[PDB]
Amino acid sequence: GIIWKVSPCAAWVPSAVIELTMPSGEVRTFHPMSGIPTQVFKGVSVTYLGS
Amino acid sequence: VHKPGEVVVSYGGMRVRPKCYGFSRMMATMEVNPPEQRIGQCTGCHLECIN
Amino acid sequence: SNSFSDDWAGKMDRAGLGFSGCSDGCGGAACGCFNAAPSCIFWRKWVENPH
Amino acid sequence: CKIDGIVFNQCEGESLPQPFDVAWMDVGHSHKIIMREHKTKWVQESSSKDF
């Protein structure tokens, strides 16, 4: 086989790339869909929507 | 043995191994903070002119 | 809706088929009966005619 | 604020009679941990002890 994984979002909204700096000194990456009020969970903080 | 398997607790951006995962009833306490405050105070009222 | 065994069993009601219900619950040192869990309250409504 | 006399958060005066029931896990340290927003995970692997 040659296998394909597929998903029907059927939409397009702006998003960006974010790197984060915990005051302790941790650095954890993630991709927020900040055009949609999505809530990504990590550690203690959560980032959300933009313009 | 007829067991489900090992447990891992992931809790808000963390990955932690439990020695013993369980639920139980506990003896606790509750607090209260009294509501309300009051104010009054002299004011200067005078009338220069009237129309 | 007619007897109300809570306050003196069931008798003539000076209301015409008023309703019944519980409510939200105060519980703690403020209401003073020292249980944590809330308390139901029973209420009547009269449709009345003095003169 | 107060559990079993052990401080959880120092506050003002507190009542007493209240049974209390939340989940908990132990990770090898003195203070127990409680949760309400946790996600568990079940993995079983061949461990010589688990036979």
Side-chain angles (χ1 to χ4, degrees), chain D:
Chain D
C1 301
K2 197 133 181 193
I3 190 65
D4 274 344
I6 297 89
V7 65
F8 182 76
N9 290 296
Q10 198 272 329
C11 298
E12 313 292 5
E14 290 222 331
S15 281
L16 183 63
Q18 203 283 340
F20 182 76
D21 62 357
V22 298
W24 40 269
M25 61 79 71
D26 195 356
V27 65
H29 296 105
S30 54
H31 281 266
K32 190 73 62 177
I33 297 89
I34 62 185
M35 61 305 297
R36 284 156 61 107
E37 296 148 348
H38 74 305
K39 314 142 192 203
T40 80
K41 198 196 192 200
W42 292 97
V43 62
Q44 52 188 358
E45 193 280 326
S46 60
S47 178
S48 178
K49 294 302 181 113
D50 178 23
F51 282 110

Side-chain angles (χ1 to χ4, degrees), chain C:
Chain C
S1 305
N2 197 1
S3 65
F4 262 85
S5 305
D6 186 17
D7 192 340
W8 179 249
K11 292 293 187 183
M12 183 278 288
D13 265 338
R14 310 138 188 168
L17 298 174
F19 269 19
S20 299
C22 306
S23 301
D24 79 325
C26 175
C31 283
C33 53
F34 60 79
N35 44 307
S39 160
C40 73
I41 295 94
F42 308 83
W43 50 278
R44 280 310 291 180
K45 326 187 294 184
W46 292 271
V47 292
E48 210 190 22
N49 189 359
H51 292 351

Side-chain angles (χ1 to χ4, degrees), chain A residues 35-49:
Chain A
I36 284 175
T38 177
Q39 310 308 307
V40 296
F41 300 165
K42 150 74 189 83
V44 181
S45 185
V46 168
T47 60
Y48 66 104
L49 66 94

